[PDB]
Design goal:
By secondary structure, the protein is mainly beta. The protein is built from one helix and nine strands; from the N terminus they run E-E-E-E-E-E-E-H-E-E. It has a single domain, classed as Immunoglobulin-like, CATH 2.60.40. The chain is globular. Bound molecules: copper (II) ion and zinc ion.
Length: about 150
Amino acid sequence: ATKAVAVLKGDGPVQGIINFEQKESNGPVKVWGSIKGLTEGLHGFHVHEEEDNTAGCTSAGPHFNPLSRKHGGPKDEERHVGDLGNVTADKDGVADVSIEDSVISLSGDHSIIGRTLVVHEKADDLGKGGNEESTKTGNAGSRLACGKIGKAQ
Ligand SMILES: [Cu+2]
Ligand SMILES: [Zn+2]
């Protein structure tokens, strides 16, 4: 219903618990979470396509894409869909997240369970670098930790 969780983890010590609450069917999805064990400062953060998390987040795909849009974030509109941009981490390597998005829904029609977030090392460039990985991921970093959105209720 309203709630889902994503256990971000990888090989690295970076692990995080994301939480989703949709307080309605068409209302925004309040995302909040804590990632623990990355470097400080801005970390690119977005939704990827994977779902077949059979063994682990090996071949986590590019950013989930509805039709065709480049990469972006909270500057451009030519953002894939799951492009949140980037989030700040404290010096201990703890990134807090607490915001509300209108671009997805875990309740109602599309019920976006399963989806694989990936947390990146460096800040999302907003795909301004002007190379494939800028336009694909915003040159954000080689997929530090990731998981899948599991229904909570
Ligand atoms: Cu990403
Ligand atoms: Zn993107």
